[PDB]
Amino acid sequence: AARGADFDHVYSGVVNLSTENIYSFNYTSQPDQVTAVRVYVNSSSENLNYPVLVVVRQQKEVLSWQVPLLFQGLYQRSYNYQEVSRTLCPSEATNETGPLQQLIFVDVASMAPLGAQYKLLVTKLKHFQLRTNVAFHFTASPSQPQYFLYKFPKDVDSVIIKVVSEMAYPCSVVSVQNIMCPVYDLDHNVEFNGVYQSMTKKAAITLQKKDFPGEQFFVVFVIKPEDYACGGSFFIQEKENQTWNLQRKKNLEVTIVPSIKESVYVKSSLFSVFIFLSFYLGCLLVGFVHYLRKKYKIYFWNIITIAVFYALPVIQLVITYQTVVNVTGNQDICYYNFLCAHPLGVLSAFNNILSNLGHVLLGFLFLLIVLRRDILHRRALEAKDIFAVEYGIPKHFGLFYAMGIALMMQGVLSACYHVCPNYSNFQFDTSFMYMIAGLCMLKLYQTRHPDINASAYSAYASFAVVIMVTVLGVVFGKNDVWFWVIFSAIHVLASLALSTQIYYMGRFKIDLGIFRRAAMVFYTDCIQQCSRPLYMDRMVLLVVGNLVNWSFALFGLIYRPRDFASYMLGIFICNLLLYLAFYIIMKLRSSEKVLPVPLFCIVATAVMWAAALYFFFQNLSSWEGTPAESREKNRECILLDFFDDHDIWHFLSATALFFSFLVLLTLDDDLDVVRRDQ
Amino acid sequence: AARGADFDHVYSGVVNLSTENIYSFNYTSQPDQVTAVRVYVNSSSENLNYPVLVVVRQQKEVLSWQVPLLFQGLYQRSYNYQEVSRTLCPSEATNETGPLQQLIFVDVASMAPLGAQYKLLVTKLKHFQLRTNVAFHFTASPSQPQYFLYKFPKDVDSVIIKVVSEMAYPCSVVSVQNIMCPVYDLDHNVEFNGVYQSMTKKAAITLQKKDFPGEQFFVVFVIKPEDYACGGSFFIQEKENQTWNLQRKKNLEVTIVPSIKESVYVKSSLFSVFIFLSFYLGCLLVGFVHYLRKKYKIYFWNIITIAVFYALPVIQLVITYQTVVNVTGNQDICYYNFLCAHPLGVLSAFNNILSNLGHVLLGFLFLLIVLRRDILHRRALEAKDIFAVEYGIPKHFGLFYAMGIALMMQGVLSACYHVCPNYSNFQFDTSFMYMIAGLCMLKLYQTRHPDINASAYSAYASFAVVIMVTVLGVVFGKNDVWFWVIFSAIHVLASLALSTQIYYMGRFKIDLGIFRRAAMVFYTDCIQQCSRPLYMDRMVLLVVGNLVNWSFALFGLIYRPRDFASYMLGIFICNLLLYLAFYIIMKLRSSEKVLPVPLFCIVATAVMWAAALYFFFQNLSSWEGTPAESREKNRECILLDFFDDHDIWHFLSATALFFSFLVLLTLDDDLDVVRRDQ
Ligand SMILES: CCCCCCCC/C=C\CCCCCCCC(=O)O[C@@H](COC(=O)CCCCCCCCCCCCCCC)COP(=O)([O-])OCC[N+](C)(C)C
Ligand SMILES: CCCCCCCC/C=C\CCCCCCCC(=O)O[C@@H](COC(=O)CCCCCCCCCCCCCCC)COP(=O)([O-])OCC[N+](C)(C)C
Ligand SMILES: [Zn+2]
């Protein structure tokens, strides 16, 4: 007959084909209080052809499972768990009902000829409901999923569920579901409703109160039987003995914290706008107290078009990804910094888009500065001011305009990328900064070799080639050492050939015989100069540039960075700064000066590039690995509770590029001299 | 006690909190024979607070459910099904075991104070195993899922499961799983393992024998409680009365057919290569019996670069999509013609990539033809042949090279698209054919207005603008009639302005005053000509072109095609053919002839364009709707058991573009006259 049974009592028994064991559990749920029941069954018996069958009957629901619980892994590997445990979906007592009397039946059965042994334990969860800002520690398992209840407070309108574990394995899933039964807490149904994240050691889910009827939800923790989805293997979690006993226990700590208010949004947007409008204010003001004592059109049409063919396939995509899985609840599509990702409307990380405002604002400010210089210059030729026709270097502002437009387009492209960062998207974070870098290095060349220009397509088919190399080296050459040696050879030889041909010899000429000329340069210690040469300054700087590029390629060879786009960005930034330094050193070697404005811009360039590169090396997310592996890297916001390290990288890279543009524009202003230069 | 019960007998009973009803079912499974058992329970009782709980205990497994079965839809709509039915996962008897004796228990329980009424029926499935090429008809339901067994024959190495229904609703899921228990046949777990497709009225899953241990699988059919995933609404399947009785019965027919052999692959690849190598053979042979009686370099670098910035974001993607969900089994990501989609390696539809071979081969053949013409011409100026300097129209082959390169790039881009067609990808099927079309129309202009050329970026920022319009009109203007009227206004006014300025008036000049000049042209019947004018031929053709474009825009206005990329392609093809016809008619109006080669090329152009456009209107898949809605359109292969209508569109569009290139190249050959032309 029925066995009136007690909570928190361990019942041991034996069940064969003849005898089936019933247990009755009676309990009362009081209003304004939620009681969850947890059933544990373990079975020392190990005969997988006669498992123990457990049935839990409630008033409105039935649950059933086998002990041992069997899982099937990839490559036909099978696991069995002798301890199974489940929380029964609770019906919460309200004032409509009063004290609810609840009955629960537990059937244990088996078809074994001689019965199977089992232990049963039914408990009431003392801590089923999670509290705001209180950290809760618990343990889960592939055969013992967990879930807890959270009720939104009356003033909180949005929360973040932050889940932390100290070990990466076992791979896990954190799901948020509504409180209507049933709860989907099994491996095969957690990803059906609600919003979920795969997790190794970090998860962070942002929830709005308006998405949940009753202002409540369940947080479900389901441990996976293998680690393939998290970047591991069949069994890379070593906990226990491999003798008829298997557990993948995971220690978890969950904290549900309220999100930032709209005051933080307002304050951060105001800060982001005003720090870069202070640039406009300072520039105009200092220029107007200093005042107190077109062939370039096509250039615009050059970059914008290249931007369009570059910027449209990414927009099309993020619009899709920001939606086509937003409604799905799968938060493994976009690789956000989920610990600093503040939503606004349909944007899941509005701070990552807002931090790109500096690129646009400073690109426009530089366009205004170049426009004023172009206007004053073109005006000075109209009055035939002799200081404009036969004094100083001939000016061609057509490439500074491209610099400013490219800065703005970099802001736009990186914002579009940060709408949803993933693997089909990565280059749009920093690839246009190659173009910018190129446009600067070219401007370093044409500032003293002015009558050399091919700005139709060879100036941008180079960008196409660089993008091809970067993308196909990320996709097809992840760390394959046969790719890295080939690319290092290309890097070293390009660096030597082009540096000996363009920097040395001063010619923009791209033959096959550059190598021959690169033999003609220095294999001449017994032809041209001694170890105490005459025009050594160019040769030492050539050797130093080649040494820097060789060291860079060597570090890339040993360390083999999987993020090859950031590595290419490092190549370009390093070479830009190196040849800018070489130009300044050559200016100082001559009798030329460095006026106060370019001097301040040089110091600001160095400082901003150091700071920007510090914040660039803070890895807060990935796309190389799995979403859980990238979530391992997430960090809280570092500035104003709104911006993380990558946002500061955006700000400071915009500022550093702006000041490098200013150096390029204002370096040669000391040449108010009639043209007798080299 | 236990009730020894019979199969195919209907047991009616009442279960309250006190009485629980058990039924025992005993049966033998013979070796080399699979027996599946199906349990049906219905409950006339309708008190959703005291459902009937059904437990089915087998030796190695337990199953349980409620009657009525409750489903929760979107927007908090709830459904209840009073008839539930399930097939128990069978353990198949082999020669290791012999005749297996199997026992099955069915528990019916309820906590109702006065019991609930129920009917129980347990049957043996007569047709659990599906046979090759035999169609099997059955019925499924959201509360009565079905699944069947298929064993691969000893010689078949790959099959296609083709599922057909005559009505689109209810929305359904067809899943393929391995035969190891349990079977995931519920709404919340079908998409966990195996490969699945959502289906309204057509599904087609291709399976390799090597993916399945034991050469067996289960085909699972699960009906969804709503139609949202298939493009419907909460309840758009009207079958039954809405009085306490709910069924979403779906009639299904499944056929498992063997796939084509590798002989078909070989024969189809040989055909695809040889039909287009016959072009090379015929061209070279006829040219060599007829023989029996560089400024253009940059042009190359123009298109390739534009191709790169266009072709790389799509490759990056398909590589991802061809994999990132290939291993997931979700076949709702790529919108193939699943009834003609033949795999080769990692490509799921190798025929769609192979059919793009004609573009590459014919683009190369045209490049060779233009190269030979360029060589003979440049040679004729070196000998100062007077027929090359003062005879005929001045020649500039720099744009024919772009035509050939663009044809090759269209082949490449459409292949990359067909690696995985979906919504983030669509333009790459036909968008580059805009460029080609443009490059042809421009060549129609410069053939008589030669000293007008701006081929730096305005010739391709137009392509960028057209791509922007197309993509943002697909994404943000699906059928929104406020988008279609705006685009129709733009189309009509662009067609009138540019046709009156470029075709009429012969000027490539883009001011705001074109409209004024378009008032100056014809609002002059009382200024220039009577109704019997002098140079009417240009005016009638102008009016006819504007009428054709207006009719096109009007049809687009009423019918509002959701595939706007194909609509833009129609605009471009129509205008190309229209102005080519106008050029030929003007040639005939003058004393000029049409030599035999351009005459044959004109006839071939017309014929190939008619055939290609017929095969273009065969809609075999979509990306506008859901994957099930696009699968409604799938068709079997029409040619060689390998190619469908879209593959023939690829072939014939390559041929039609090739012959239009030939018309453009060879039309003006009758001008062996000294230059006294208009
Ligand atoms: C006189 C004038 C002086 C002026 C000099 C001015 C020159 C300017 C100098 C420096 C500017 C360079 C910026 C570096 C940016 C590289 C980024 C990168 O590669 O990412 C990879 C790291 O990289 C590696 O693992 C090793 C490769 C880096 C080589 C280091 C340069 C040293 C070479 C020369 C030194 C030898 C000296 C030569 C001997 C003569 C990946 O790492 P990550 O953590 O995944 O990347 C983070 C980004 N992401 C996080 C968001 C993923
Ligand atoms: C001989 C040379 C000189 C003449 C040259 C002219 C020849 C050149 C003519 C045509 C060249 C191109 C042919 C049409 C291509 C349209 C494509 C299209 O829009 O698809 C849409 C159909 O769209 C519609 O159903 C309505 C729009 C079509 C308008 C028809 C033009 C009539 C105008 C003139 C008549 C009145 C003129 C009055 C005279 C004063 C979408 O439908 P679909 O089925 O999804 O598309 C299938 C594609 N896909 C399936 C694979 C998805
Ligand atoms: Zn960024």
Ligand SMILES: [Zn+2]
């Ligand atoms: Zn196609």
